[PDB]
Amino acid sequence: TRAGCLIGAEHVNNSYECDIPIGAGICASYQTSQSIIAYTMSLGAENSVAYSNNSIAIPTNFTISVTTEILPVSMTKTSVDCTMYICGDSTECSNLLLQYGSFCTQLNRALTGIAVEQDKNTQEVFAQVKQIYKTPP
Amino acid sequence: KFNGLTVLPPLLTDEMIAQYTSALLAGTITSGWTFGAGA
Amino acid sequence: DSTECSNLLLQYGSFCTQLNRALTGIAVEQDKNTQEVFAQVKQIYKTPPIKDFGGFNFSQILPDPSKSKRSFIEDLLFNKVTKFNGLTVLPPLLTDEMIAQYTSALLAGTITSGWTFGAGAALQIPFAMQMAYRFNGIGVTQNVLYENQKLIANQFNSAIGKIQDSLSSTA
Amino acid sequence: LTGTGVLTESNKKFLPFQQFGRDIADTTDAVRDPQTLEILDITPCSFGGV
Amino acid sequence: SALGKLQDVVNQNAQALNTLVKQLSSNFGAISSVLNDILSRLDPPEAEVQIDRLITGRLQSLQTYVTQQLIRAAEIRASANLAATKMSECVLGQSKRVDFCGKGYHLMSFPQSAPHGVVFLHVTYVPAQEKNFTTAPAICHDGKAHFPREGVFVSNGTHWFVTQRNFYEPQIITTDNTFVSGNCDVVIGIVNNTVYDP
Amino acid sequence: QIDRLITGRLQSLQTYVTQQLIRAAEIRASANLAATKMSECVLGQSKRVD
Ligand SMILES: *[C@@H]1O[C@H](CO)[C@@H](O)[C@H](O)[C@H]1NC(C)=O
Fold it and tell me: How many Cβ atoms sit within 10 Å of the Cβ of residue C122?
């Protein structure tokens, strides 16, 4: 292929929707006794709209679809003890580490910044209503 | 979780989140959009 | 190619796995980006052979079969833009011909069906009337267009020509 | 093996020859008492912010 | 497999934590990955070197972890701003931004909570089944042109009607559905007909 | 000597990978913007000024 050396798959002349992407337009799929085929994916059923200069198409009926959309809003608030992480309960290590300065403290400050930004995120997304309404019985 | 690896709890608990979303849904159902512009 | 070096490096842990995983995340997100930008049309529409568009001339942007089935301005753009150590460069999943097919589909849809082809099934409608709707959307009654159709055609054509010149001349 | 913890009588069932127990992140969590064969847990004694 | 986004966030954080922990069991070029063990085996002069190596290694791993977390938190904040915008413009009101609130004309939406994230139900309206009518931009009645007020002129080959753009519902062409202008001369493709008058 | 060379090359590699992470975040921002602009500006007519 134009991607590499494919080993173990038949080469079809057809073209179907891409099931497993490979690269450079090649897609492989498990089909009919069956085996693995590698084709050049097709982009969809071509279609020629019956255009003219005086013909218009108007709908007559309608459908009420209901789609879904999922969004992430917040990570998990993690904190990391500087000392107990690197050399938990080893005085020699603490006294050696003191020579590197404020690096660990800096990292702690960063992780607290993140841990507060999370609650700000959730607060901003949900708490947009002033009162707490209630449906009628 | 054993080496200073603490996992703090979230300030808003799932019950309060559910209450928030029930409020928005009841508002939209009974009042349209007007509840986002005022009363 | 140094076994001693590899065996020494093994003492540092999973750094290789970490870096490889990061770069693989990036390498897949790229194709996800291109997929999300272009692959928004369900079918692959096609313009009719005749070109009765109230007097407008789209030959400068519609494809021509005489090549890389790209268009003129796509050509101007593609021309105005000009290993031993694991440095592999993966190939992009969508090749330029398929990108060109996507954009030709969107363009033919916009020309022959207005916005309706983005809300469901494409419904054809004469271009002059489509521009009438587009006008009436910005608070200018239709009769202005219907009375000034040829002048608007000439202005649009001349503007397309100026775009060709600007791109072909400065880069 | 060494280490600091709070040893408590467990209910895990080792094999007759096993000695340790480990977690998904490969940390010791249960030790068989080499004198009286009772399997103890290991809980790292409490720390935390103020 | 619809909740891949949230499941992915959880998995990413779990793997980051597990890599951070398993970095504790590496030697970084020292003798043994345990501190107390070297503290017993070696005297302070050499315990200093072994320690210093372990400290350099663990500190580098920790900085790498914190940078990964900073970047991923910036991305999550981007997605959170997007969710806030979508709830404020798509629930608390009806929007006219195409495909911003689900494929089709937008009617309303309802939110639903979910562990670390939100889930919208975009209620949309989709036109269904069409007919090939014959049209014309305007009509001549008395030499003067007649354009439709809010609609479009269709014709089933036999008669003419004015109908709204999105739902075939033909109406007789009164002098109220339309408004007059100019004459027959200038518009292209006009058709003779009779506009009734109430 | 090796250990020195390894430390150096590893640090350089991490620096490169961090540069790439940041630049890819920026390009993904611009790609989301392009997707929004195509969906609202081609597939329909917009009224958002400029
Ligand atoms: C539409 O095209 C046909 C093709 O010959 C032509 O006869 C007719 O006059 C055209 N109609 C308009 C309104 O331009």
Answer: 23
The DSSP code sequence of C87-138 is ---PPPSS-HHHHHHHHHHHHHHHHHHTTGGGTSS-----HHHHHHHHHHTT
Going along chain A, which residue ranges are E strands?
Answer: 10-11, 20-23, 26-31, 35-40, 46-48, 55-59, 62-71, 78-80
d(CA E111, CA E88): 11
E172 Cα–ligand 1 center, Å: 26
Find the angle CA(A129)-CA(A131)-CA(A136) to the nearest 5 degrees.
110
Which residues does residue D9 pair with via DSSP β-bridges, in sequence order?
A: D40
Residue E140 Cα, gap to closest chain F Cα (Å)? 31
Nearest to E190 by CA among E178, E77, A43: E178
Whose alpha carbon is nearest atom 13 of ligand 1?
Answer: E189
Cβ count within 10 A of residue C146: 24
Determined by cryo-EM
Other beta carbons less than 10 A from residue E111's beta carbon: 23
Judge: C115–E130 Cβ closer than 8 Å, yes or no. Answer: no
C54 CA to middle of ligand 1, Å? 10
User: Any residues with CB less than 8 A from the CB of E175 and at least 6 apart, and which?
Assistant: E146, E195, E196, E197, E198
Burial tier of E90 (Cβ tally within 10 Å: 0-12, 13-18, 19+): buried
DSSP string, C52-65: -STT---TTTS--S
Q: Strands, E, within E55-144: which ranges?
A: 105-114, 117-127, 130-135, 139-140
Rg over CA atoms, chain A:
30
Give the minimum alpha-carbon distance from E42 to chain D in angstroms, rounded to a whole number.
17
Inter-residue contact C33 to F27 (CB < 8 Å)? yes
- DSSP H or E run through F13: helix F2-41
Tokens of A93: 């290590």
Write out the two tokens for C56: 């407008």
Which residue's structure tokens are 């709830």? Answer: E87
Answer whether E100 touches A (CB < 8 Å): no
Buried b (16+ CB within 10 A) or exposed e, B6-21: eeeeeeeeeeebeebb
Tokens at residue C33, please? 């980006």
Give yes or no for a contact between C112 and C47, defined as CB atoms under 8 angstroms apart: yes
Please report the resolution in angstroms: 3.6
Q: How far is CA A56 from CA A1, C124, E137, E151, in A?
A: 46, 6, 11, 13
Task: Measure Cα distances from E118 to C166, D36, E165 in Å.
Answer: 47, 54, 36
Q: Tell me the chain A residues in contact with residue B23 when contact means C-beta distances shorter than 8 Å.
A: 129, 131-133
- Enumerate residues lining ligand 1, CB below 6 A: A 53-54; C 52; E 189
CA–CA separation, E90 and E88 (whole Å): 6
Say whether residue C164 is in contact with chain A using an 8 A CB cutoff.
Answer: no
- The answer to whether residues D8 and D40 touch, using CB atoms and an 8 Å cutoff, is yes
The secondary element (H helix, E strand) that includes residue A72 is: none
How far apart CA C25 and CA F25 sit, in angstroms, is 11
Judging contact as 3 or more Cβ pairs under 8 Å, the answer for A and C is: yes
Residues E84 and E176: their CA atoms lie apart, in Å, by 45
Looking at the complex, report in whole angstroms how far the Cα of residue C170 sits from the nearest Cα belonging to chain F.
24
Chain centroid to Cα E26, Å, comes to 44
Give which of C124, B21, A35 is closest to E91, Cα–Cα.
B21
> From the CA atom positions of chain D, what is the Rg in Å?
12
C155: Cβ–Cβ under 8 A, 6 or more apart, which residues? Answer: none
